[PDB]
Enzyme design. Structure first.
Site, PDB file in Angstrom:
ATOM      1  N   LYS A 136     -66.816 -25.345  -8.468  1.00  0.00           N
ATOM      2  CA  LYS A 136     -67.737 -24.795  -9.406  1.00  0.00           C
ATOM      3  C   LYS A 136     -67.900 -23.307  -9.173  1.00  0.00           C
ATOM      4  O   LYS A 136     -68.781 -22.919  -8.555  1.00  0.00           O
ATOM      5  CB  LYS A 136     -69.134 -25.562  -9.282  1.00  0.00           C
ATOM      6  CG  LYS A 136     -70.126 -25.202 -10.401  1.00  0.00           C
ATOM      7  CD  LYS A 136     -71.468 -25.977 -10.196  1.00  0.00           C
ATOM      8  CE  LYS A 136     -72.129 -26.233 -11.494  1.00  0.00           C
ATOM      9  NZ  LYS A 136     -72.542 -24.977 -12.094  1.00  0.00           N
TER      10      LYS A 136
HETATM   11 MN    MN Z   1     -73.107 -21.176 -12.948  1.00  0.00          MN
END
Ligand code: MN
Length: 395
Positions: A136
């Site tokens: 991420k």
């Molecule tokens: Mn973010």
């Protein structure tokens, strides 16, 4: 069992996969637009979910093209029967009058336990693997697609072009990184525009660069650019490329790649993620989280198996980092810094930040809008000879 390493070498082993492809159906598109238009209207009695419609003009377009940006209230994605669960969503009209989806983001997805589908027992009951764990990356989202006239369209979440509201829009910063990326590999914008329309696709990148807007992990001139983590079909439902093909696309048009781990059994995913969260680091790098991609059914029975995501965000040392950034920002203004957790190390860090902030005031304002955030953080990190993980468990 952390002997899964993240990799960005899947791309060429993606040779046996076919990217999903569906053409847009203009009747169903126009039907979606009237559903959104009715949600955009502020006096009705029924139709209980709100959207804001912002048209946008494509400055770089020869057809005088325009796009509409559709934004839902955040809580509406927790309701059933939305006309689409796309987060970023732009529609347009071809110079020959056909309605189209110009930009389709991911479906809004949630962290573990923040909804009832993101409970571990539910993920174990209604999802199906192999589970894709994607790094991420920590920046701002950028959408890239190609219009019918050949215009390459660059959007941030919800916006495109220049606005009288900010100094340099996220999408402009993203579009400038895209231009450098393509020239370096001898490709042009219209070739990318032509390609993305050929795939009926939105490219989904994370713009990560500290020269622009610095987040919680650093992206210097070395690391800066667009990290490609998704390709989605420009249609009402959510159909997304498996990550190996995203990496192959990243390699063909110069994007940075998003690291990928594939785990077959969901219990191994859960054991893996919780093991990485004991340090917030992976393979020598620090990581804020993983995006887990997989297939889910409404109820585990007959019917659906749609692409589905959930996030696993790593909870420390990053909450400590946030506290240090907000405390440093607080101490440049006339406000007393709040200390909520990590009291002992936080007052040590504030002790040192005050020494460096009084030395030169020009540090003290580059931290309002954020220069020196990680630099100030990592400077004390080894002033005290610590990895951020060890500081976070001093308690
Ligand atoms: Mn973010």
């Amino acid at each position: 069992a952390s002997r899964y390493k993240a990799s960005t070498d899947y791309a060429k082993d993606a040779e046996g996969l076919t990217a999903p492809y569906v053409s847009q159906d203009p009747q169903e598109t126009a039907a979606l637009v009237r559903a959104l238009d009715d949600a955009a209207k502020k006096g009705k009695k029924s139709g209980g979910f709100s959207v804001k419609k912002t048209r946008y003009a494509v400055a770089s377009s020869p057809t005088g093209a325009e796009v509409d940006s559709w934004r839902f209230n955040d809580w509406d994605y927790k309701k059933p029967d939305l006309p689409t669960y796309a987060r970023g969503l732009f529609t347009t009209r071809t110079q020959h009058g056909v309605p189209e989806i110009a930009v389709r983001g991911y479906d809004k997805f949630f962290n573990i336990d923040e909804t009832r589908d993101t409970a571990w027992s539910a993920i174990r009951e209604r999802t199906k693997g192999p589970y894709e764990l994607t790094l991420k990356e920590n920046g701002c989202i950028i959408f890239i697609s190609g219009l019918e006239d050949g215009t390459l369209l660059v959007c941030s979440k919800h916006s495109t072009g220049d606005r009288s509201d900010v100094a340099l829009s996220h999408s402009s910063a993203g579009e400038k990184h895209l231009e450098a990326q393509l020239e370096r590999i001898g490709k042009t914008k219209e070739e990318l525009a032509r390609e993305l329309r050929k795939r009926n696709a939105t490219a989904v990148a994370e713009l990560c660069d500290d020269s622009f807007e610095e987040h919680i992990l650093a992206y210097g001139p070395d690391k800066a650019g667009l990290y490609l983590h998704g390709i989605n079909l420009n249609i009402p439902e959510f159909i997304t490329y498996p990550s190996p093909l995203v990496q192959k696309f990243a390699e063909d048009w110069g994007f940075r790649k998003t690291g990928l781990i594939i785990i077959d059994n969901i219990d191994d995913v859960k054991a893996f993620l919780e093991e990485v969260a004991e340090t917030g680091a992976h393979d020598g790098r620090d990581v804020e989280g993983f995006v887990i991609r997989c297939k889910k059914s409404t109820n585990p029975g007959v019917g659906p198996y749609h692409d589905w995501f959930f996030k696993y965000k790593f909870e420390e040392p990053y909450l400590m980092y946030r506290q240090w950034r907000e405390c440093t920002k607080a101490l440049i203004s006339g406000k007393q810094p709040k200390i909520k957790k990590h009291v002992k190390i936080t007052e040590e860090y504030l002790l040192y930040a005050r020494k460096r902030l009084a030395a030169d005031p020009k540090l003290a304002k580059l931290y309002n809008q954020n220069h020196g955030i990680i630099k100030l953080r990592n400077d004390f990190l080894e002033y005290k000879n610590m990895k951020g993980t060890d500081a976070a468990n001093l308690e």
